[PDB]
Nucleic acid binder design. Structure first.
Ligand SMILES: [Zn+2]
Ligand SMILES: [Zn+2]
Ligand SMILES: [Zn+2]
Ligand SMILES: [Zn+2]
Lengths: 77, 84
DNA sequence: GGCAGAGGTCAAAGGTCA
DNA sequence: CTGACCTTTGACCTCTGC
């Protein structure tokens, strides 16, 4: 075995874009990069990413994807 | 393929929170659970719930949502940071 | 062959606002 | 508050190039 997502802590499906991650953070990363979305944090860019609340701040979720080694260049068309 | 809200009998849009429901009963259940709304029935707590009378009693509508198998645990956290 | 890590889909969750 | 109308999520897939 059981690996956990380095982004939100949910059970990871395997490595995606360079990081051990859940289907959730994988899909969120892909769509964020495809559609060239930087988001905006409505609270000081210190939001906690966990399984149950990871959808609260898109900006802090993308920030943690990149901090944890997800690679924009591994997302293709 | 036309199916029907197990709560009010309006035309359903799909499963919502574990029951075949219309957009109204879906939106109502979310709002209710999200804000911890319990209601008060103004008449004996067995108000009839259908398309025409669904807004007559919030308490009997929510109670009927639960009876038909809508799950509060299926309602997620609001998608904003806490106190924003 | 084998399978990791890329792809895709759409039911059911979200949110919006006359 | 309601609900018609809209967007995003993520579990379950398939494809493929080492
Ligand atoms: Zn994750
Ligand atoms: Zn944030
Ligand atoms: Zn209904
Ligand atoms: Zn009542």
């Amino acid at each position: 075995v059981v690996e956990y997502c380095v982004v939100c802590g949910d059970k990871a499906s395997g490595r995606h874009y360079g990081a051990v991650s859940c289907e959730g953070c994988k899909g969120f990363f892909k769509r964020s990069v495809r559609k060239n979305l930087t988001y905006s944090c409505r609270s000081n860019q210190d939001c906690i990413i966990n399984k149950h609340h990871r959808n609260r701040c898109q900006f802090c979720r993308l920030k943690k994807c990149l901090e944890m080694g997800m690679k924009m260049e591994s997302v293709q068309s």
